[PDB]
Amino acid sequence: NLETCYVDFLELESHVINEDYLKESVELQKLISTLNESKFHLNKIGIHDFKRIRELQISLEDDLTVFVGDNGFGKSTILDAIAIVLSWLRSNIEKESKPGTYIKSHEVNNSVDVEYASIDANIKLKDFNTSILITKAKEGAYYSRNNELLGVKKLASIYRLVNKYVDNASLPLMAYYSIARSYIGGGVDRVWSKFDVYDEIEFDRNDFTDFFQWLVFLHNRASQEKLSESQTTINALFSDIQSLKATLTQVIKGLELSLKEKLNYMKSLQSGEHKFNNAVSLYDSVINTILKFLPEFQWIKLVYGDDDYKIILKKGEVELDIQQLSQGEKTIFTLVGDLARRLILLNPNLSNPLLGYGIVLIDEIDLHLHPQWQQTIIERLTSTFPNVQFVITTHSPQVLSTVSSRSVRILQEVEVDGVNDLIVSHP
Amino acid sequence: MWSHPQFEKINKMNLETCYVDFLELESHVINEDYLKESVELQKLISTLNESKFHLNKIGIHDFKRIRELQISLEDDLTVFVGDNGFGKSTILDAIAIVLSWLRSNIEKESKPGTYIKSHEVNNSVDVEYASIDANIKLKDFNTSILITKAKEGAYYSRNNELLGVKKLASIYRLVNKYVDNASLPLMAYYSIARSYIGAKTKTVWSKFDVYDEIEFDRNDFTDFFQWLVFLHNRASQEKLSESQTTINALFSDIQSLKATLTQLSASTVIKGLELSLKEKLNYMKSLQSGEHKFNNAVSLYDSVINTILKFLPEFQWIKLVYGDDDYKIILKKGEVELDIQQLSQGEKTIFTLVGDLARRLILLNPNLSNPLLGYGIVLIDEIDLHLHPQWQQTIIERLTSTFPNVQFVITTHSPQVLSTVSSRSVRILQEVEVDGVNDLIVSHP
Amino acid sequence: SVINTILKFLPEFQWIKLVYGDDDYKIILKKGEVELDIQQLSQGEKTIFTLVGDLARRLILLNPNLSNPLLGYGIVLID
Amino acid sequence: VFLHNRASQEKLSESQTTINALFSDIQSLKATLTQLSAIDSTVIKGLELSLKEKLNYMKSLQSGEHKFNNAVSLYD
Numbered sequence A: 001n002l003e004t005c006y007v008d009f010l011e012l013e014s015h016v017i018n019e020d021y022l023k024e025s026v027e028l029q030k031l032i033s034t035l036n037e038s039k040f041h042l043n044k045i046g047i048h049d050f051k052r053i054r055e056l057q058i059s060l061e062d063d064l065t066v067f068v069g070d071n072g073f074g075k076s077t078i079l080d081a082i083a084i085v086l087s088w089l090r091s092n093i094e095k096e097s098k099p100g101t102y103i104k105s106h107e108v109n110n111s112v113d114v115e116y117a118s119i120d121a122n123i124k125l126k127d128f129n130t131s132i133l134i135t136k137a138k139e140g141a142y143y144s145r146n147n148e149l150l151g152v153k154k155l156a157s158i159y160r161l162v163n164k165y166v167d168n169a170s171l172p173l174m175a176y177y178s179i180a181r182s183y184i185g186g187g188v189d190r191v192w193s194k195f196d197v198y199d200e201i202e203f204d205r206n207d208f209t210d211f212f213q214w215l216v217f218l219h220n221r222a223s224q225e226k227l228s229e230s231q232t233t234i235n236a237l238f239s240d241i242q243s244l245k246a247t248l249t250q251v252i253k254g255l256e257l258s259l260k261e262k263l264n265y266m267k268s269l270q271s272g273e274h275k276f277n278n279a280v281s282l283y284d285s286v287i288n289t290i291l292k293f294l295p296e297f298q299w300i301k302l303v304y305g306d307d308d309y310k311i312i313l314k315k316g317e318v319e320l321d322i323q324q325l326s327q328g329e330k331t332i333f334t335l336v337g338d339l340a341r342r343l344i345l346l347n348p349n350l351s352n353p354l355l356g357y358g359i360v361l362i363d364e365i366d367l368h369l370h371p372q373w374q375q376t377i378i379e380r381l382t383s384t385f386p387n388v389q390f391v392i393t394t395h396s397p398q399v400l401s402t403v404s405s406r407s408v409r410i411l412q413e414v415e416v417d418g419v420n421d422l423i424v425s426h427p
Numbered sequence B: 001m002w003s004h005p006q007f008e009k010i011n012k013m014n015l016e017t018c019y020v021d022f023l024e025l026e027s028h029v030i031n032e033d034y035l036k037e038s039v040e041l042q043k044l045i046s047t048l049n050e051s052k053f054h055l056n057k058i059g060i061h062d063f064k065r066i067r068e069l070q071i072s073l074e075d076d077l078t079v080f081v082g083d084n085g086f087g088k089s090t091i092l093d094a095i096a097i098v099l100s101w102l103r104s105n106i107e108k109e110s111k112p113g114t115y116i117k118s119h120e121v122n123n124s125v126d127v128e129y130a131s132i133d134a135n136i137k138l139k140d141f142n143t144s145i146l147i148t149k150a151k152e153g154a155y156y157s158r159n160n161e162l163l164g165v166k167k168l169a170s171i172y173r174l175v176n177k178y179v180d181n182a183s184l185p186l187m188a189y190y191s192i193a194r195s196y197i198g199a200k201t202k203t204v205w206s207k208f209d210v211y212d213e214i215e216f217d218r219n220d221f222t223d224f225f226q227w228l229v230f231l232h233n234r235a236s237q238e239k240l241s242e243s244q245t246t247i248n249a250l251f252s253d254i255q256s257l258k259a260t261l262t263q264l265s266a267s268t269v270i271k272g273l274e275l276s277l278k279e280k281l282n283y284m285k286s287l288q289s290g291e292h293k294f295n296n297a298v299s300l301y302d303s304v305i306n307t308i309l310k311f312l313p314e315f316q317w318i319k320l321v322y323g324d325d326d327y328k329i330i331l332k333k334g335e336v337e338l339d340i341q342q343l344s345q346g347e348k349t350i351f352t353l354v355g356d357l358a359r360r361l362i363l364l365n366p367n368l369s370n371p372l373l374g375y376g377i378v379l380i381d382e383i384d385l386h387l388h389p390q391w392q393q394t395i396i397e398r399l400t401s402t403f404p405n406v407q408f409v410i411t412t413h414s415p416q417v418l419s420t421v422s423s424r425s426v427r428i429l430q431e432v433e434v435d436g437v438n439d440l441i442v443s444h445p
Numbered sequence C: 001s002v003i004n005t006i007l008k009f010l011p012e013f014q015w016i017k018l019v020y021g022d023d024d025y026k027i028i029l030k031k032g033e034v035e036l037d038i039q040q041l042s043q044g045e046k047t048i049f050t051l052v053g054d055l056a057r058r059l060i061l062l063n064p065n066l067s068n069p070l071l072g073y074g075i076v077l078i079d
Numbered sequence D: 001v002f003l004h005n006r007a008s009q010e011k012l013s014e015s016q017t018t019i020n021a022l023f024s025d026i027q028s029l030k031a032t033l034t035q036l037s038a039i040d041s042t043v044i045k046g047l048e049l050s051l052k053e054k055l056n057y058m059k060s061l062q063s064g065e066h067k068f069n070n071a072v073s074l075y076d
């Protein structure tokens, strides 16, 4: 009983003092164990008078659900509705009563019979359950019923309290890869990471530059920490900060920020972990993860020259930069790099960081891929990220031909009582 | 691009000889009426009109991945098939590069075009430069062009050969000078950046606005909207005025004829009324719209609308409705009216592609009765973007049927389209290691 | 009503109309036996044009019942 | 504003000691720039601009001995 354990722990800590004993309290350890055992899951969702859809109840499996359908059959509507539902939970977790995304005026059905739009959802964590309803009526109409957010604020409170007690607490990933994952840049060829700053970022993705910066930082940490060649790094950083202070005594905001950065660098001794999951292990895991999806290439490196860093790939007998790749490997490299970036970043305690929990939504999985790549992408993604839940869409038969019978949902349009309505089915 | 004393040589009827003869003749006569009525101008115009634009062959050396390779293109349709990383795009950018210099030299002579970027040359140790060559055949007239760039760090120079393009462009400008509504060729390129699609109140439209850039991106969609409403209001102006008078009088005669059907069918007054109706109908048929096909207005607007509706069989009609402060395009799918922002990605892609092609063709050929029969070349990359297999099987034959005098170059990715293409217009790319060096080859089926 | 008001203010013209040509569109004014464009007018004529246009627009919109809307009441201040 | 402030110096009857103080401040700024050059591009550019301004002020002070320009006359 997660709810009972949470209530008991809150009651015990509320009428107690000496936060040190609160940390030593077995209730917090039990809560942490219960949270770790629990796995993120979205069991079902109901849609009412949203866009083309007029009435629908959908249930999703534990691992992977794929919607196959023709053009104009509401495939993207399902993803947009799920994104809307997840937005409120994300906002509540990140900040106190943070407003989320609403339902736009044109989202409601165009028929004159409908007066309001509503979305209902349910989330299950092992044994605990919760639900949420979001509504938005039409223009110029009474009975403006409101939305219910008590359940999501309940869920959120547990996570924020757990992260407050333990600074190493993990969090669930929620991300959404839309059609926008493609641009002229294609997610490539568009000051400091500040160590780790947990990102409750928007589910969509627009900028990959962070990836580059973050990587550069991981490489510098890898060289300095595991390969030594730094001596008394903390003392040297403190001396650099002292010289900065002397220069300041002898643009002011920039100098102060640089001094704070020097102090943060000098805090490396304060951090002092050098654990089994060191920087070089993370670097090798990232590189081998990317190379798993690109069998043709041989090795990837980061070359420093002309006071700048660049990425070098080897194909056959010719070395290529990053600008010279095609769109096919640009898409795969960007998507995989961002997904593993978030996994490695939001779970700083696991021995193998690619084992967290989350939910990922992908639209049009088969963009810029030849059939040979289309026959094996889904198995690679499923095997690589085991404890994640995927929701993807596709219309290419080559994608569907290698999918199990229990994971495929087919959309159909059928006219009942003179009105065409969308239905779903299993083979 | 200059004059000569017309060296006799041997008798021939080449387009170049007519061009030189006209240049020699115009250097003597001063009156413009004689020049505008001379038989040499008529010969030059007829020869230029009956000739058909057609790119012949292309060769690539040391450019991007391709090391050395030559292709020959059919005059109506060609398709390249391959996997990722096989240089499908490289050919298209090579053709766009060579066509840019011809585009530039028509606006104003001695104007530069597009060069080779410094990161396109091959990365191998033994390379020194890269080059591209091409050839354009106007029935019996042949031109060629070479573009090249030396690798950075070398100390040996290379130039470009630009005699052919300058000479060909001068013919087009000379014909455009002495003819009111001369046509021009059509060149376009639909890159993979059509995804980005999603004022000062311009009042003047001309055929030289479509020559600003060869590629399609961003503001062309905006201008298409401005152009469309301009067409619609012109139809309204023609719908009013004297066209109403003949509409009303004929309707009155129809009513009178209907009355003759009634009243138990009732010379004299009947003969006079019938004669007046016959005279009015004869007068209206005599006008024949005044300009007939030339008047356009309604016919052009409906031709554009029906052309767009040809690719979307599930829709009924498209309308332009004036809101209180803005204009709106309204569709109707099934039994529900739709807006342009509420369409799926596939229908948006087809809408933009067909609308842009129709706008370009109509703008470039004003004199033709049916503007959809112009010449030119069109390049398309990955035709199967956001399209289900049902639409994949029929897009090609509809594109070829709607525009029958336009050369097409298309690159594809899936076997669904390959099931509906003739064997004479398929080129298949491959990778083969020969003499210890990996290289790309093209094989006919 | 607005067009007739402007025509009444300036009797040296004959008619004003908007013409959609084959490749453009423009406003045409006829005076005597000459056709002129709206953009050939000087600064003074444009100032008078917009002043009378706004005054007529307000007077028409304020008296929707009178047979001749140019017989309203009010006060106008010009600097 | 600038024209007025310069005339105030003439009213203040600033001697060569002001020039010496400005030169000392310029030397200190140069020393700080040299120290910062070792182990902030915008800061370096700002320091270079300030040093250039100080050098221009020193040249203006030198030109002041050559009958100056009578900034009070320009103001009037």
Ligand SMILES: Nc1ncnc2c1ncn2[C@@H]1O[C@H](COP(=O)(O)OP(=O)(O)OP(=O)(O)O)[C@@H](O)[C@H]1O
Pocket (backbone or CB within 6 Å): A051, A052, A070, A071, A072, A073, A074, A075, A076, A077, A106, A107, A108, A109, A110, A111, B333, B336, B338, B342, B343, B344, B345, B346
């Ligand atoms: N308010 C509305 N009322 C009625 N029909 C609507 C409304 N909004 C959208 N539609 C219809 O929904 C259809 C599908 O739109 P939608 O954006 O859901 O595409 P989709 O099929 O999910 O997308 P994709 O092809 O990317 O999978 C459109 O053809 C449109 O006619």
Ligand SMILES: Nc1ncnc2c1ncn2[C@@H]1O[C@H](COP(=O)(O)OP(=O)(O)OP(=O)(O)O)[C@@H](O)[C@H]1O
Pocket (backbone or CB within 6 Å): A315, A318, A320, A324, A325, A326, A327, A328, B064, B065, B083, B084, B085, B086, B087, B088, B089, B090, B091, B119, B120, B121, B122, B123, B124, B381, B382
């Ligand atoms: N300078 C270069 N030297 C060697 N190879 C290069 C160079 N520049 C690009 N390439 C090669 O070009 C290949 C991609 O070429 P290209 O984009 O034409 O192919 P494509 O995948 O068929 O095209 P698209 O997906 O854009 O339609 C890369 O795999 C890379 O090896």
